[PDB]
Amino acid sequence: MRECISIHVGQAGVQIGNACWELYCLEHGIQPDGQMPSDKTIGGGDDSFNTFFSETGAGKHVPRAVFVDLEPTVIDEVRTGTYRQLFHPEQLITGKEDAANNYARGHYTIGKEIIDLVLDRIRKLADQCTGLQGFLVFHSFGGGTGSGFTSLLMERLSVDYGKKSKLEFSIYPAPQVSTAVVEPYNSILTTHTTLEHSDCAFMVDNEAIYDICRRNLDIERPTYTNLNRLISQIVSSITASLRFDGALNVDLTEFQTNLVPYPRIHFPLATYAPVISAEKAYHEQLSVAEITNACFEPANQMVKCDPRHGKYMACCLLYRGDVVPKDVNAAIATIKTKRSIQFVDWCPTGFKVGINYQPPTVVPGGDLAKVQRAVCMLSNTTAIAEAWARLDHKFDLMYAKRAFVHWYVGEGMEEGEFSEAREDMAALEKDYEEVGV
């Protein structure tokens, strides 16, 4: 057994962590107080779920998690919230004042005074691990803390834990739920500095989640809570194979091997079906063929882009619920003849399938209805470079006039770091261009 530490940076990371650990607790049958009555080895063990939870002599199952925010307000709701007992205070780290939507204030100014504290609290979890394999980092591209402090953490984790893997759950910025005008700057800056330090990154465009919540859940104006509970389903599907008995994606190293041949191009597209409203009056249950087919509609993707115009390098199907291999192979055979699925010549046109029979769990009183079967496809497609092109253009428009740059320079950062970061992104868009033509 090999342990995994989850790190949650900024508001987005923290509030998405909440949604995830709440869901993990429901899936494994762990309570608000941390007691898991189904566990029989009291105060220890090396089961699949022990990858995400350590144990105390008292029988409590405590998340291998560190929540870090430069402002107390958000993490205080964790400290007083329904899962207050689940974490111990040293896991929940809060600063005094935030990075104010500024990468440079998060990375350089306020980052420096708190980085040693966090790495120390990370070391206090790593010393409880008999075989740490690495880290899952949750954050926003848009926030100052999420962009700035995260990239500093990822720099230092490569120094301290060089042999261990680092996965990212990144929230890509959208005007529909934006907190700042400079989020394109922060997104490019952090992607540049984090790129070589991150082994695999699952981007979630808030635009994509927002419209899924409008279109499929019938919610006029989605809150963060709506977006996060949907995000945590996608996260849970991706992490399920680390937390449950299986033979696909069993360690973090396998995510690199399966999904990431080119190391810079390490941004797999997640697609998820089906998303169904909890107070839909009459619902017809969707089959293996229908939900597998839904994995190739752009309207169900975590990032809106077009996989038809682009090439695949790898494709995972992660099923949860009533699914058998026979149905999956028959679904794939039908879809192959009707849709435009093109792999790169140097890769096999094929799918790694993983079924878990336990159907997806939903939060009681939530917006998501129970389903007999669901699926999360993880495809490394070049079509996700569309998200980079969008974001880089917005950067160019502002940076051409040096708009807002003085805020960054005023925290110690050099103007050079902007165009240095932008050149890397221009190279990244070229890396995608070559692979998919």
Binding site: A104, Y108, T109, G111, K112, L152, E155, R156, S158, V159, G162, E196, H197, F244, D245, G246, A247, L248, P325, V328, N329, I332, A333, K336, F343, D345, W346, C347, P348, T349, G350, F351, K352, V353, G354, I355, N356, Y357, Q358, G410, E411, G412, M413, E414
Partner: protein, 54 residues
């Protein structure tokens, strides 16, 4: 068409299906980068306090 490396258990089962074949910086340098930005902040705060002194 060809299903390979099928594995099963009580929780689930996994396999592969192939349709067609093919054809870091140090702790020193990080501390140097952070502190060079702290010196540029201090220089800028000095220029402000020098201007206010005038």
């Amino acid at each position: 068409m060809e299903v390979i490396e099928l594995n099963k258990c009580t929780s689930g089962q996994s396999f592969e299906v192939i349709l067609k074949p093919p054809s870091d910086p140090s702790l020193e340098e990080i501390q140097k980068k952070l502190e060079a930005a702290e010196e540029r902040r201090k220089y800028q705060e000095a220029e402000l306090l020098k201007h206010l002194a005038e």
